[PDB]
């Protein structure tokens with residue numbers, strides 16, 4: 001028999017919003033941990049339950065150091081200084097604190113008018129041209145790209161270049177392709193730094209150049225890695241939430257109608273979509289630097305551990321009928337953004353963008369529908385951020 005106690009991980013979605021069959025099996029199997037086999041044949045642990053996931057994300061013995069030989073790499077792509085997503089305290093905090101000013105609740109509130117303007121501008125163009133359109137290239141991707149560009153001080157004129165490079169890095173299936181894409185972005189950002197040294201400019205990259213870099217408090221290549229992380233996360237991840245949210249909501253028309261009828265439900269719907277779609281398991285990897293006993297299971301020093309937030313988010317002890325989309329439920333404490341010192345820097349920018357986008361789509365494109373069957377969509381594999389790379393849509397064309 002072929003039966004194993006260490007199934008291949010990750011699994012690929014066959015429905016944009018449903019747990020892969022293999023993940024349902026992991027979810028249903030008692031205990032916080034399960035053994036899996038990664039692409040290169042190495043065994044690692046996955047964390048599959050909600051409280052255990054929080055506990056392990058909060059445990060400093062589970063390091064975020066991606067340079068470690070034993071870090072649980074899920075694809076050949078995983079093969080330069082790390083941005084703070086790959087650092088542990090105390091280094092993590094010194095670098096993260098260089099960027100937090102741009103993501104405060106006050107700044108996010110100040111960004112609302114800008115986000116609304118950007119969203120409506122891309123809708124103007126799309127709706128003027130008429131259906132059909134690919135929602136990804138025409139809306140889902142450009143909106144957060146334009147927003148993160150202004151936040152960073154990266155000129156939006158270079159969007160085609162950096163969007164292509166970002167996709168190649170995030171979705172590469174080989175190390176060579178990933179490395180070329182990273183090199184492309186690094187060289188670009190290094191040029192921007194030099195330009196800011198000549199002519200001080202706006203945006204987070206400008207601020208880091210004028211202050212921390214000028215004071216020797218961040219290495220030039222660390223600034224490059226940090227800007228790269230924010231550029232990629234700031235547009236690729238939110239774009240995927242948009243497209244997958246549209247697909248999901250169109251497959252749940254009663255809930256979508258209820259949402260349209262009472263816009264005060266939108267923040268809660270955003271939480272539920274984040275919980276339900278949980279697009280970022282690829283950011284759950286950890287390596288143990290010491291032995292950790294977990295409800296009788298032993299993680300040994302040097303073992304890889306992946307905190308699979310998508311499965312933790314379907315823990316029925318926390319979310320009653322966990323596989324049911326319910327925009328009125330308490331989706332409080334979901335792990336779609338992680339938990340603890342590394343909890344997503346951009347989480348509230350993501351929440352703002354999704355709220356503005358859903359309200360705009362309901363206002364201006366109430367007749368929006370998919371232009372192809374859901375089954376015909378091509379879903380990204382579990383080795384990258386979840387999503388679709390194309391989303392054909394149509395609507396009632398008003399002249």
Ligand code: HEM
Pocket residue numbers: 064084085086096229230233234235237238241278279280283284285309335336337338339341342343344345346347349350
């Ligand atoms: C719905 C969209 C998003 C999702 C689901 C998401 C998910 C996540 C997750 C799960 C983590 C934790 C990684 C870990 O524990 O190792 C994380 C961290 C991070 N995210 Fe996001 N993210 C999103 C959007 C964004 C945006 C818009 C930005 C823009 C700056 C961003 C920037 C970051 C950064 C810088 C970190 C590292 C934080 C740290 O290490 O202290 N993310 N994200």
